[PDB]
Design a protein around this nucleic acid. Structure first.
Length: 51
DNA sequence: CACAAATCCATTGACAAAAGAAGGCTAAAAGGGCATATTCCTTTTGAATTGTCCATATAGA
């Protein structure tokens, strides 16, 4: 385990910021893909009524 | 050998204890959420197999 974790190198602070921006990009892409789906709204409407 | 009485087995009935449940409770058990910065652990003996040279037989030059 120590070897396989030692091959990978650490991160720079700006590096971590880059990775975080990548994650936001992914999550926003998936939220937009959900947004182009009408039943994505229908399910939330039904659930609110349930509450 | 029949008729008169004391002694048995059965239901009425009620009555108290006991248990199966149900709810109301409370102790407890299990999640979840934490944002100055944390970067690589602490005795031999023998046999059988496996990896290492050696004899050697053959094939080209």
């Amino acid at each position: 385990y120590m070897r396989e974790m030692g091959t990978v190198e650490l991160l720079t602070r700006e590096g971590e910021i880059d990775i975080a921006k990548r994650i936001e990009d992914g999550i926003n892409q998936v939220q937009c893909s959900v947004a182009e789906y009408p039943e994505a709204i229908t399910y939330l409407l039904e659930q609110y009524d349930r509450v």
